[PDB]
Design a protein around this ligand. Structure first.
Ligand SMILES: [Ca+2]
Ligand SMILES: [Ca+2]
Lengths: 585, 585
């Protein structure tokens, strides 16, 4: 075998505890290069003569070029040393240890996970493990209070097409009035984009972190919203913009006024005074040359303390978690301490980051609970919407992403289809509802946290920002109720099937020709197989199914009862049809 | 090329800053697969159609199976995205990014290092960068005060062969009385094994963390040592045993007496009560079944606070750093807060850990400054002492270890030859001084921090514990002055040639047949080539030397001047001779 392609490290996503006495370990090798992977381990202090314990590492999946093997080590002592025994296709075996590879175990050396502290077991909120989150763009969800509308608010109609500076009067009172709707849909949490006081239309340039923007509401109204959503089993998540503040931020206006005499000058990154200019700026900002968005020096104990007080203030209002913005530009110490603060105030408070690249450095257990799964969106777009990739590629991309972080993070990843900054998924599907639905069926049954973008559940369409920010369609006759019921049904199933929320995922079938993909979610003895026929054709397929997993399944969507004969399940799907097979366990 | 063998990650030891605006990046590939490696990068927010900056990554080294390439990216914005352009032996051009590999730059995507925070730039003490540590085993270094000598103390002679429980009376007073000796040698720091009050001989079972053990001295004496050492340019490093306390530790004593009613019961890991019994332990301890060494619950904020106070106490006494014992069994948060505390009280205080496996998790810059380089010792023993490995294997071992951590850590790793727990290195060489000297020559000119084990510089020998803990030989007649002068000479050169302390490392020559190995240390325009003839035979070697780095060199050990002709240098080395060639720059 090709040893230079084999990999493992005793940390990060390849070695991490799931409990105080259990260490999950993962190893990758060139695809098809390793047939069997066994882990020989023992307590780090075991005598050089004691027998080692064996752990067969099953193949958790494979992507474009790699095979992923996964094992679980039982370490009652909370300390462990281990070596891998790898067997190739033609029987050649080799031990893989910290020292390297060798036919002899001793020369291979041994990896070591020094100690498993309970405080370092990646732990996330139970409710978030089976949540369905709904993204609200407040300005356009519901206008419950016309008296707070910005000057020049345009009419709220379906035939409306938002402009970069449009206004429709969306506010918090509206969200309250429409909570019955959200409860009926079945969402377990609402995620709001910035709603703190800001002079701009987007609100990403914060003026007052301790106040709701007047056009959206005020503290009393926000408290009501929190309480009304809670009694309806709906949690509240706010968007925290701690990387940078607005130019109206009290601290920044002070610097603009007193210059180098300001007591808050070190709360920012200023090259030279005075602080301003035309098309020019002498201080670090969000992105490049964005005057209204001066970057905050979070490394400053004073800045950190202030933002932490902001965090305390809103959590005291009863919110259930945070969605960080440009989190990757704030230092790690801030995030480690942020988690400590947040969790000490509310163990169930969720911390979600938004990072457009490998976020492993933030998903170890000491910082964020999860991040936006942009990888999930890209794979769903190219597979169900544009058709740029086929079932096998789809499978590879999905698997590769899955092996990116520890299972506690991957299990809570926010799986979005679109957002206020992208075209609506329906439009990506060119208006084809059959493709749109197949994608939602996948989203609702895949590993991670489903995130619904307001309006998608009733079939709203739209081009990217700002056309994706149209006023929510509330007229029932104008809503796609067929779709609405589809979402509600998928949501109900997800809550009733433990494997869809707390189960693992394994690819079941992948056919590039028929463009059909199937996977299985598993929890204990329960198995739920999802088969997706992503073709505008009636296709038939043969799936492998050993009696151990059962011989009878039930399609939770149609009630049909399928039967496997001789370890095979014959299925015939309609164009863009998806089946959700439950093994009755 | 084997694409599944190529590696890089935008963090850890493969992507890290060396300053606020410079990012060091490393890429691993199967040896020989890549002949040229370039990096195309830009600010993360740069426009697509914007021209990318170029950075050539030279081959930093190779080990048994891989080539390691290294480049330096200039990032004025402190934000960078990048993709590698790898060229193979046949001229194939493949791009490598976060997405994967592709013949097209766009399809390979880019890695991203979100933001470089100055507080995240790995920083170590300046004095530690060019230090020479001397390990002192107090009981055997010098008996300065017989009044504190424990009962049964033996004689202090060369022919004294220590027993497991022998005594000689070494103490702090003795250290002070011998400071002139240590100053002459040229050591800049003293590393002491545990010396806090303990009822055992070894003192690893701390009874009182706030007191010097009576057999070694008292606080007034310790202070005197700190001051007298300091005015001698000698710093003091203490052994911190924070993973576990002794059974005499006040908190544990209270638990043994008040059991379940004990106020400090949660300061330890107790299975059941009563907290103890005959020959049996019901609480977690160091290693396995060591009743005298109860494990401390450093996760308990109260335990952390106490241990932090302990650190404050000794730092107020003027010490310059800590050598942590069993540090990998203490939680990470503890070490991060420890560093924060230690650096706040004294930015120049050093923190060294001891971990017998990949310590990358503690060497990111937020925890330890460095760790003992056990790999260095293993490589020097097999190459210089036992001859189990030849020059090429030796080269590979060094390179592999060198690429384990970021440069800031690698530069300060303690490169020891032996310790109180191993046989004397001279003994490892079977008494062959010629081999012993070549290893020392190497130790004194290689990357890292040289650590002298008391007595090695005067020719002391001995088998492992306790024969390696023999009474220090103080009779000049009994001391190997020739060797002493050799050490002193090497130490002077190290302090005068900046490249030997702050320069990088590049293998220069490695021949498995001649068993000759050479490397070059480089800083600014200065180049110091170290040539090692590790064979009992006069040999000649032709080394490659492009005129760019100079054409004339001076052997700093003999005064001999060598000249290169047409890019080549002909050197004739005597049996086990090492040369230290300075390029006059
Ligand atoms: Ca309104
Ligand atoms: Ca004494």
């Amino acid at each position: 075998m090709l040893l230079e392609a084999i990999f493992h490290e005793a940390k990060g996503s390849y070695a991490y505890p799931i409990s105080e006495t259990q260490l999950r370990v993962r190893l990758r090798a060139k695809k098809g290069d390793v047939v069997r992977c066994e882990v020989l381990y023992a307590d780090r202090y075991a005598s050089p003569e004691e027998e080692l314990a064996h752990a067969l590492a099953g193949k958790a999946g494979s992507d474009e070029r790699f095979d992923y093997f996964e094992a679980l080590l039982e370490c009652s002592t909370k300390r462990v040393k281990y070596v891998f025994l790898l067997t190739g296709p033609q029987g050649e075996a080799v031990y893989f240890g910290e020292t390297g590879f060798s036919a002899e175990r001793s020369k291979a050396g041994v990896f070591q996970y020094a100690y498993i502290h309970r405080s370092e077991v990646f732990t996330t909120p139970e409710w978030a493990k089976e949540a369905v989150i709904y993204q609200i763009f407040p300005e356009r969800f519901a206008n419950g209070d016309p008296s707070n509308d910005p000057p020049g608010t345009e009419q709220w109609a379906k035939d409306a097409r938002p402009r970069h500076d449009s206004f429709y009067g969306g506010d918090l009172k509206g969200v309250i009035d429409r909570l019955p709707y959200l409860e009926e849909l079945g969402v377990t949490a609402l995620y709001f984009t910035p709603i703190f006081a800001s002079p701009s239309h987007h609100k990403y340039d914060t003026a007052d972190y301790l106040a709701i923007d007047p056009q959206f509401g005020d503290l009393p109204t926000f408290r009501r919203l929190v309480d009304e959503a809670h009694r309806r089993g709906i949690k509240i998540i706010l968007d925290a913009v701690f990387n940078h503040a607005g130019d109206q931020f009290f601290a920044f206006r002070d610097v603009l006024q007193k210059g180098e005499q300001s007591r808050y000058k070190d709360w920012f990154f200023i090259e030279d005074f005075p602080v301003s200019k035309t098309s020019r700026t002498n201080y670090e900002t969000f992105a490049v040359q964005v005057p209204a968005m001066p970057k905050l020096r979070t490394e400053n104990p004073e800045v950190k303390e202030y933002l932490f007080d902001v965090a305390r203030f809103w959590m005291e209002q009863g919110i259930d978690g945070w969605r960080l913005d440009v989190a990757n530009e704030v230092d790690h110490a801030f995030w480690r301490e942020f988690r400590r603060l947040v969790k000490s105030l509310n163990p169930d408070a969720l911390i979600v980051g938004e990072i457009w690249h490998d976020a492993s450095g933030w998903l170890m257990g000491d910082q964020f609970d999860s991040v936006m799964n942009y990888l999930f969106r890209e794979s769903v777009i190219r597979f169900f919407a544009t058709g740029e990739i086929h079932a096998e590629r789809f499978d590879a991309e999905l698997t590769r992403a899955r092996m990116l972080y520890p299972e506690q993070a991957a299990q809570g990843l926010w799986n979005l289809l679109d957002s206020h900054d992208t075209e609506r998924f329906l439009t990506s599907c060119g208006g084809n509802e059959a493709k749109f639905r197949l994608a939602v069926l996948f989203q609702m049954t895949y590993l991670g946290t489903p995130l619904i973008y307001y309006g998608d559940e009733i079939g709203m369409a739209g081009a990217t920002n700002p056309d994706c920010r149209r006023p929510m369609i509330w007229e029932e006759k104008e809503q796609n109720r067929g779709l609405f019921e589809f979402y509600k049904e998928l949501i109900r199933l997800r809550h009733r099937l433990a494997s869809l929320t707390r189960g693992n995922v394994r690819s079941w079938h992948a056919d590039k020709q028929a463009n059909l993909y199937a996977f299985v979610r598993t929890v204990q003895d329960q198995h739920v197989g999802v088969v997706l026929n992503n073709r505008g054709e009636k296709q038939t397929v043969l799936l492998q199914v050993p009696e151990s997993g059962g011989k009878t399944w039930l399609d939770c969507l149609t009630g049909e009862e399928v039967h496997g004969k001789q370890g095979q399940l014959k299925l015939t799907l309609r164009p863009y049809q998806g089946m959700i097979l439950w093994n009755g366990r």
